[model samples]
Target: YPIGTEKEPNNSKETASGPIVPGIPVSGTIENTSDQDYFYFDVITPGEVKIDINKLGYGGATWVVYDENNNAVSYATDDGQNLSGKFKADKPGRYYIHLYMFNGSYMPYRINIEGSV
Candidate 1:
């Protein structure tokens, strides 16, 4: 496995909004209704920063990506249960990828960021 990314226990906008770089994978759990996970990354190399989010158990999830300007870049409701999104990392700036539950329930998720250094 690739040990080139961050570890577990990542759960908030302030936490994800921390020093975690873009294109690096991080994993966490949706502990409750208020449980929303946000991950931030900056693009130095131009390519597709594809995101892979799969429900670790039963409950499904959704995600939205935001550009550097805080503009909504891409949003997906359902990628047929397990979801994966591709964000155009062509623009170099701070970008965010957020994950949440469809309903108020506990859910485990693993988000993997792939593409360009």
Candidate 2:
């Protein structure tokens, strides 16, 4: 549910975090009152990490890529419609994906990530 409604979630902490599958692309919405949407993915077989975040519906968004250490590996701010980032993974580890809305009036974006184990 979106923010500011009777059924809206308690907070951003109440939102769901998902996994990025190689063959499957998961979808999520960035609520009007939230800062980001988080996802976790692991690379069992080190390769490359590629991501694409778009305003899938009503708004624009940006995204950040974090290493297993929770360091900001890369990020792309929302620019009109799309945000993208890439990383070369040389070791087996997990990474975090965070999506933030560019503005509150327009929220929700589609994020897709791929590569590795």
Candidate 3:
């Protein structure tokens, strides 16, 4: 997979970074304690998907995978280590990924999704 860059100002679902394809990885920085990052992608059918979030440096960061209706499908935290999880999409639509750090460092982090559609 090729490396991807986060589009800044992607702090909200309406301003999410992409309708990105799964399997590629994206990198972004946390500007402040209040900064949140959002990324989204579409799937054609209900299927199992995997998400991985890796903080470049040490600290805690949390992530959630939400469906088109803003329902949480999966969640994880990069506390003891980087976060990775798998979940099933019950229906076909867009899914959003949200990242935030409350007790974490200000370093960049990487995220990747697999088997999305």
Candidate 4:
């Protein structure tokens, strides 16, 4: 599929950047330490979800996966070229991915979601 561009003001779950389709890639930016990017997705049943972050402009980024009720289910910080995280979906509903700068990253990156949603 083609790439999708991230929208600004995506600083929270209410203003997330997506209903990110599994196979689609989204291009985004981490403006500064104060900047946060959130992406939303949906699932239909109990299963696992996978997220991949790549094309980091510099050092790295931070990621956290939250469930429908705003619970942090999984998280990781990738100080490399890419990052990946997987979390379990306990029910059918919306989920969120929160991305932030790692070590003051002020650059671009790409994100993708996948799995048995």
Against the true structure, what is each candidate's TM-score?
0.74, 0.74, 0.89, 0.87
Lowest-sum lDDT 10-residue window in model 1: 1-10
Deviating ranges (above 4 Å) for candidate 2: 1-16, 58-60, 77-79
lDDT (tens digit, per residue) of candidate 2 on 2-113: 1211122322323426456655655556656454566667778878888877676665567777777768887885567778778888878777776666656656556666
Candidate 2: global Cα-lDDT?
0.63
Off by over 4 Å in 3: 1-3, 77-79
> Candidate 4 has which clashing residue pairs, if any?
none
Q: Taking the tens digit of each residue's C-alpha lDDT, what string does model 1 give over 43-71?
A: 77788777677777566678898876778
Put down candidate 3 lDDT per residue, 1-117, tens digits, no spaces.
233878988989999988667667788888766889998878887889888888786567788889989889998844466778889887899888888887765858888788955
Q: For residues 1-117, write the lDDT of model 4, one tens digit per residue.
A: 233877899998899877787777889888887888888877877898888888567755678988888889888646467788887787889888888875765878888788865
The lowest-lDDT stretch of 10 consecutive residues in candidate 3 is 77-86
For every candidate structure, what is the RMSD over all alpha carbons to the true structure, in angstroms? Answer: 3.7, 5.7, 2.2, 2.3
TM-score of 4: 0.87
How accurate locally is residue 23 in candidate 1, as Cα lDDT from 0 to 100?
57
RMSD of 1: 3.7
Judging by lDDT against the true structure, name the best candidate.
3
Number of the top TM-score candidate: 3
